[PDB]
Amino acid sequence: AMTQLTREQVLELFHQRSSTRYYDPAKKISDEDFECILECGRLSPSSVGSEPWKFLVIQNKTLREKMKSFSWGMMNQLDNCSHLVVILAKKNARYDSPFFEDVMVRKGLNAEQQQAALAKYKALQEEDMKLLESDRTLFDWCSKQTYIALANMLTGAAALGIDSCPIEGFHYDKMNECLAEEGLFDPKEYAVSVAATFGYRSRDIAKKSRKALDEVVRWVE
């Protein structure tokens, strides 16, 4: 049968998922649990099946130490967290690129289906979403897809009883340069999108503070 939760269980999960700034350095996530977290990212949906992401798992302590200088949003977490993921997004993911040829093959499209798909992707990028305005608009489209993978990794971790924190608080140019200089990706192909820490909290879970549902929802009947 299928895995299914009650509404109460779903809400519990989303109140357990919180941004963890204080991790217990004595508790490490198992290799099995961490592989499951990564699989939540891998299995995430993405526009046109583009999967425009790479997951860098930064366990090396010397590299984490170097990041402290320019990563104010995770300074405390770098020494204490079990695992750190830096998510990259694909650069220059144009409809007519070799990257997109591979997207289509993972679907198994023949020449005619590829022709129709290419026309759809061109319309999506050029006219519907206007992504071809600049390199940054096209990069940011791929980056949006990586935030889906991020969200699913945080939620999957929480479902396994593992704490996490999403991270934007770092100097992106310095982070890109540092990780490229370490040989972790080709900077012509990918650039840093967002990061996340994972581990076990050393403090209580902070209560949710959010705008009310009536503030954020408008119903059009």
Added chain:
Amino acid sequence: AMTQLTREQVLELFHQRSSTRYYDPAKKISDEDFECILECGRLSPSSVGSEPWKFLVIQNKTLREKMKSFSWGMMNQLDNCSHLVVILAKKNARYDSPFFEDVMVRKGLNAEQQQAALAKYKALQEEDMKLLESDRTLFDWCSKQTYIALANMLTGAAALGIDSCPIEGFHYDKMNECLAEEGLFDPKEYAVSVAATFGYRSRDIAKKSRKALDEVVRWVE
């Protein structure tokens, strides 16, 4: 106690979550289940607690019909899905805006804490992430946060046994103009980010096709 799943259950959930293009028009999501889905969006994390989203629930059939002309990615789904959400993202969410004053209050910051937070947000936007390059770069930052809310709504729906589909396949300028002309938001304040349909599938769940874990993960020990 806390809600917790096994690795096998988490993976099942992420294989059950699939992009549903074919919905059974006879099956409607209950008001209670749909409120739970919306709460998964509301409870989502967001950079600096910005929550830069609105959720428009488009149930009106005449409005759905109008969208068909310019929404190729959800044409089939518009007539058959139970619920449709169009997610908006905040425009011009500058660190020094009234929008950001409210972000800080939901945290309860006094004048000195606000001063420190404003300095952090200014550094994040101006220098770390370089969001102030253009209106679009700043909008796309908020839009990225809305993709977290999207992902969590899809996953929460799947956990409740409800099918969904994320949607970018529409003309954004036409969609913005149409929904603003209906009075659903102030177009000076928000613009369309991404959409999603929800309902019960009329076909089998399609098997996952993804790049292998070894393709997308790089481990830095």
